[PDB]
């Protein structure tokens, strides 16, 4: 793909939408959108492949005082095409700040499937 969209929800208040775009096959992915219903400050942001015991770390999103995290990053590590495409994987937002590729960001607050958009 060249664009993907994950719509995030949970059983609590956290919800949002994250968009991905990649103009070239080996080029960086632009990740942008917003997530609401979060406590102010940092929250772990990960891509999980179903089954796979490993995780794609996208760092932290930062919520403002109203609980709104606007997201806008470039990520050279993930891709929307090829052998390691994140298409179909689950995007996750966490309770606490990221603690690594394999460390504990606490529980999952919302998630959604990264779906092809273009």
Swiss-Prot record:
Lipid attachment, kind S-palmitoyl cysteine: 6
Effect of mutating residue 57 to A: Loss of zinc binding and enhanced tendency to form aggregates
Cross-link 1-(tryptophan-3-yl)-tryptophan (Trp-Trp) (interchain with W-33), sequence positions: 32
Effect of residue 71 to M: In ALS1; increases tendency to form fibrillar aggregates
Consequence of substituting residue 96 to A: Decreased succinylation
Sites bearing N6-succinyllysine, chain numbering: 3, 9, 65, 96
Disease / disorder: Amyotrophic lateral sclerosis 1: A neurodegenerative disorder affecting upper motor neurons in the brain and lower motor neurons in the brain stem and spinal cord, resulting in fatal paralysis. Sensory abnormalities are absent. The pathologic hallmarks of the disease include pallor of the corticospinal tract due to loss of motor neurons, presence of ubiquitin-positive inclusions within surviving motor neurons, and deposition of pathologic aggregates. The etiology of amyotrophic lateral sclerosis is likely to be multifactorial, involving both genetic and environmental factors. Spastic tetraplegia and axial hypotonia, progressive: An autosomal recessive, neurologic disorder characterized by loss of motor abilities in the first year of life, after which severe, progressive spastic tetraparesis develops. Affected individuals have severe axial hypotonia, hyperekplexia, hypertonia, and myokymia, reflecting upper motor neuron involvement. Cognitive development may be affected.
Similarity-based family: Belongs to the Cu-Zn superoxide dismutase family.
Name of the protein described by the UniProt record: Superoxide dismutase [Cu-Zn]
Gene name linked to the record: SOD1
């Amino acid at each position: 793909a060249t664009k993907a969209v994950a719509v995030l929800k949970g059983d609590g208040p956290v919800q949002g939408i994250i968009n991905f775009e990649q103009k070239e096959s080996n080029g960086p992915v632009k990740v942008w959108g917003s997530i609401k219903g979060l406590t102010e400050g940092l929250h772990g942001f990960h891509v999980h492949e179903e089954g796979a015991g490993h995780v794609g770390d996208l760092g932290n999103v930062t919520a403002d005082k109203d609980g709104v995290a606007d997201v806008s990053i470039e990520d050279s590590v993930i891709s929307l095409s090829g052998d390691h495409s994140i298409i179909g994987r689950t995007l996750v937002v966490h309770e606490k700040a990221d603690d690594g590729a394999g460390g504990n960001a606490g529980s999952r607050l919302a998630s959604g499937v990264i779906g092809i958009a273009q």
